[PDB]
């Protein structure tokens, strides 16, 4: 009663309820969002997409009629106390269920659809619960679990739709940061999956959108390496575009090629720091970045091109 397995059962029931609600008449703008960026009904079914209806307590009453207590639904991050009693967390938004590697639903990502939504924020998430941990949660990990372990390769994208675009394109190793900064506990989980017996072989591919944030995300690499920046790589789409948009304009094959055309994470972060730039401030900014490389042989390789670049 209020146990881990019970909280999981509520989320699975909520995922079913929300998935069904996507076919309602009021969920047409949610279906529009998906079809407008080329995700068909079968794709929406694969990732478990749903719609949080306009009834303020419609999930809560639905789960309450199946025997779930309000105390359990608050613990699961599904319901919360309103003025008139128990009410839903999510309201009039396109939902993606966020699943563990096994495939157990632990929370939801909720995107804004209507201009009269009281919540101004573009994306909204499940709060910190027993099951949901912002720092370790990853969208797409259930579907990619097998192919990253077999292929020894993980592709990290930013958004929910970027993962969907990647998996439909054939890049089934794609996963997302999931409503927060990526680093620390996802790397541990991804490293752990790509490990052969005893030693680390695989590689990690970050795919940033064409933006100033591309470099401003890449500088985080040097802030704690965790011996994975040597095996980390960077791909960047034609300026302005993210993976979801790239698949719309240039098709599924263009995304597979994007992942193939990857630069090492150090090389990218350094050469980008040199590119957008003088020589006084340059050699000040770049020599700490190279010095923080813990491997001596790999440090010497990049240390050569500081004179060149």
Coordinates of N, CA, C and O in Angstrom, one line a residue, residues 98 123-126 128 132-139 156-160 176-183 185-186 220:
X98 N 8.1 8.6 -19.5 CA 9.5 8.5 -19.3 C 9.7 7.2 -18.6 O 9.3 7.0 -17.5
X123 N 8.1 23.2 -21.5 CA 8.1 21.8 -21.0 C 7.9 21.7 -19.5 O 8.3 22.6 -18.8
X124 N 7.3 20.7 -19.1 CA 7.0 20.4 -17.7 C 7.2 18.9 -17.4 O 7.0 18.1 -18.3
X125 N 7.6 18.6 -16.2 CA 8.0 17.2 -15.8 C 7.3 16.7 -14.5 O 6.7 17.5 -13.8
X126 N 7.4 15.4 -14.3 CA 7.1 14.8 -13.0 C 8.1 15.3 -12.0 O 9.3 15.5 -12.3
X128 N 10.3 15.1 -8.2 CA 11.1 14.1 -7.5 C 10.3 13.2 -6.7 O 9.7 13.6 -5.7
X132 N 11.0 8.6 -9.8 CA 11.5 9.6 -10.7 C 12.7 10.4 -10.1 O 12.6 11.1 -9.1
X133 N 13.9 10.3 -10.8 CA 15.1 11.1 -10.4 C 15.6 11.8 -11.6 O 16.2 11.2 -12.5
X134 N 15.3 13.1 -11.7 CA 15.8 14.0 -12.7 C 17.2 13.7 -13.2 O 17.4 13.7 -14.4
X135 N 18.1 13.5 -12.3 CA 19.6 13.4 -12.6 C 19.9 12.0 -13.3 O 20.9 12.0 -14.0
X136 N 19.1 11.0 -13.1 CA 19.4 9.7 -13.7 C 18.4 9.3 -14.8 O 18.6 8.3 -15.6
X137 N 17.3 10.0 -15.0 CA 16.2 9.6 -15.9 C 16.6 10.0 -17.4 O 17.2 11.1 -17.6
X138 N 16.2 9.2 -18.3 CA 16.5 9.4 -19.7 C 15.4 8.9 -20.6 O 15.0 7.7 -20.5
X139 N 14.9 9.8 -21.5 CA 13.9 9.4 -22.5 C 14.5 8.7 -23.6 O 15.5 9.1 -24.2
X156 N 23.5 11.0 -27.8 CA 22.7 11.9 -26.9 C 22.2 13.1 -27.6 O 23.0 13.8 -28.2
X157 N 20.9 13.3 -27.6 CA 20.2 14.4 -28.2 C 19.5 15.2 -27.1 O 19.5 14.8 -25.9
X158 N 18.9 16.3 -27.4 CA 18.4 17.3 -26.4 C 16.9 17.0 -26.1 O 16.6 16.7 -24.9
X159 N 16.1 17.0 -27.1 CA 14.6 16.9 -27.0 C 14.0 15.6 -27.1 O 14.6 14.6 -27.5
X160 N 12.7 15.5 -26.8 CA 11.9 14.3 -26.9 C 11.7 14.0 -28.4 O 11.9 12.8 -28.8
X176 N 17.8 11.0 -24.5 CA 17.7 12.4 -24.2 C 18.0 12.7 -22.8 O 17.9 11.9 -21.9
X177 N 18.5 14.0 -22.5 CA 18.8 14.5 -21.2 C 17.6 14.6 -20.3 O 17.7 14.4 -19.1
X178 N 16.4 14.9 -20.9 CA 15.1 14.7 -20.3 C 14.8 15.8 -19.2 O 14.7 15.5 -18.0
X179 N 14.6 17.0 -19.7 CA 14.2 18.2 -18.8 C 15.2 18.7 -17.8 O 14.8 19.2 -16.8
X180 N 16.5 18.4 -18.1 CA 17.6 18.9 -17.2 C 18.9 18.8 -17.9 O 19.0 18.4 -19.0
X181 N 20.0 19.3 -17.2 CA 21.4 19.2 -17.7 C 21.8 17.7 -17.7 O 21.5 17.0 -16.7
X182 N 22.6 17.3 -18.7 CA 23.1 16.0 -18.8 C 24.6 16.0 -18.3 O 25.4 16.9 -18.5
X183 N 24.9 14.9 -17.5 CA 26.2 14.8 -16.9 C 26.1 14.1 -15.5 O 25.1 14.2 -14.8
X185 N 25.3 11.1 -13.8 CA 24.7 9.8 -13.5 C 24.1 9.1 -14.7 O 24.0 7.9 -14.7
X186 N 23.9 9.8 -15.8 CA 23.5 9.3 -17.1 C 24.8 8.6 -17.7 O 24.7 7.5 -18.3
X220 N 31.3 22.5 -21.0 CA 31.0 21.7 -19.8 C 31.8 20.4 -19.8 O 32.1 19.8 -18.7

